[PDB]
Amino acid sequence: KAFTIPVLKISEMTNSRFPVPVDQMYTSRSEGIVVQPQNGRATIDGELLGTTLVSPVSVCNFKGNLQAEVPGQHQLYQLQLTNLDGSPIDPTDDTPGPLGCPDFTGLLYGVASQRGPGDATRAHEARIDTGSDTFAPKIGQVRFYSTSSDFETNQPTHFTPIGIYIEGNSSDFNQWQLPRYGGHLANNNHLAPAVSPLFPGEQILFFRSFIPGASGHTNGEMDCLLPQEFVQHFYQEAATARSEVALLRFVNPDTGRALFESKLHKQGFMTIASSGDHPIIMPTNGYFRFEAWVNQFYSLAPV
Amino acid sequence: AFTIPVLKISEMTNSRFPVPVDQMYTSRSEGIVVQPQNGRATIDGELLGTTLVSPVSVCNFKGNLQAEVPGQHQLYQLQLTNLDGSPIDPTDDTPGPLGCPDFTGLLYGVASQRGPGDATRAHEARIDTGSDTFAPKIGQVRFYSTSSDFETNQPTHFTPIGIYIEGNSSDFNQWQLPRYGGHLANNNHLAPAVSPLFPGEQILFFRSFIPGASGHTNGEMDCLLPQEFVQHFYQEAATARSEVALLRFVNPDTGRALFESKLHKQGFMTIASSGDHPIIMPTNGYFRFEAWVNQFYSLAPV
Ligand SMILES: [Cl-]
Ligand SMILES: [Cl-]
């Protein structure tokens, strides 16, 4: 079975780290930054890594029982998580945390909804601090705060992510700081490895989204390594990787010729020949196409 | 030539609302016109109605916060763009802009803005898709919010979350199409209604229970094709060798095949069944293409 890429414009791609469309391609030097996201992690021969799931609407969602209001802390609610598909959290799993769990620290803004008893429903805005000491999704312990007290204990509860809340303090959004999946008394394990460009003059090519902000000042930048459609496609195809690097061409369909070329590394990230922090803006109908198997030494024309 | 993506039910996305599929479901749909406009694609990849390929975009809106509606209390006038940023073209051969809700109800979600600069703000919001002001085809939609914290003339996005049941707004009717053009306009360029034609068969739906924000509702939202089937058919552009693709639902744990279904060329599935009930199957089961048949192929009941 031959390796293939799905044919997609940038505007048809889905961010694999937050359930919103990709806005632009982006490259960065990543000065002082360790790139180690756990969502959107898949090898090109079909192995999912980190907390990556294939569903494109599920990343950064939570589901669970509303166990209780945290004693003494009004309108702070303790969830007992399940997995997003309904199966119980199993902390013996070989994952950093539950599939789809946020891979960044910050004030995640969204809506907590309930259905029950019966068909009675209710929903209100909520905030989950993925940087807080007790944020421990690996063992199913997550809390959310809400300005509403209209939540019932022991009813099924879902958290739909919307964006990030900026208070202007230590809790501020850091898309490259992994949470402590087990809370403040446990260390992360089974992480997908960090990635970096190893070849001179190359930088990682990211797929960037500007996610919504709920207060304060932020551009909401969320950079993933692969659009969710590439994850889904490699998962489906599980094609044999004939070399360590798949050479991609970003094709202008109006001319048939290359706009630029990129190296898709087998472990699931792309590099380009570029320098600095800036978007990669192209004609809107451009798409990546698989060109050939090459090695890590292949020299790319700069873009 | 023709393939179906290998997906469990829990890995499928509802094509009419951006949530995972909860179950397969079948119904007689007596006295109901089944004519959803999202999740509509032929098996050779032609998108119909308002169907787009992005799985996170259906029921989203974006555009300029034109004004607080004069007279009204905390009503905001959106001037839509298309979800890809391009301008709304009312002469397009669609009933409305791609991704537009295809049901009438009080759609609940969060309206967010960014601007001026990187200043941001977001608050709960709801859009009555049955209101006579709801006219997305010409880019006019209003939302209500308990908050007054919205800047005029800043980019605004509506992220859908669920449905809101209250007496003084339209109840959630998933099979009642909005008037995409506002009060007086007739809908046009609609994907057609679907129904089983062979005796003993019913449509097979992929059902989600979308969140409720208030009131009593089971949030039932039935689509004809999971969004991943839509994306796959769009990618493949494979020629339909007959009018029906015969599919088989199989459990990979045991190799047991559980039932067969008829995937009609124009983009929906039927099974031999009777009554309104979920189709509960082993968790790891999935559909697989078996053969090109016609509309008269007779299935064993499930
Ligand atoms: Cl597979
Ligand atoms: Cl195409």
Numbering used by the authors:
A (entry chain B): 225 to 527
B (entry chain A): 226 to 527
Verbatim from the authors:
The human norovirus capsid protruding (P) domain binds histo-blood group antigen (HBGA) co-factors for infection, and a recently discovered bat norovirus (GX) was also found to interact with HBGAs. In this study, we determined the P domain structures of four human noroviruses and one bat norovirus using X-ray crystallography to examine structural features linked to potential interspecies transmission.
The P domains of GII.9 (AY038599), GII.23 (KT290889), GII.27 (MG495077), GVIII (AJ844470), and GX (MF373609) were expressed in E.coli. The five P domains were structurally equivalent with a root mean square deviation for C-alpha atoms ranging between 0.586 Å (GII.23-GII.27) and 1.645 Å (GII.9-GX). The cross-reactivity of the P domains was determined using direct ELISA with a broad-spectrum human norovirus Nanobody (Fc-NB26) that binds to a highly conserved region on the P domain. Fc-NB26 bound to GII.9, GII.23, and GII. P domains in a dose-dependent manner at concentrations less than 80 ng/mL. Structural modeling of the Fc-NB26-binding site indicated that GII.9, GII.23, and GII. P domains contained most of the equivalent residues that could interact with Fc-NB26. Our cumulative data show that Fc-NB26/NB26 binds most GII genotypes, and the epitope is vulnerable and a therapeutic target region for GII noroviruses.
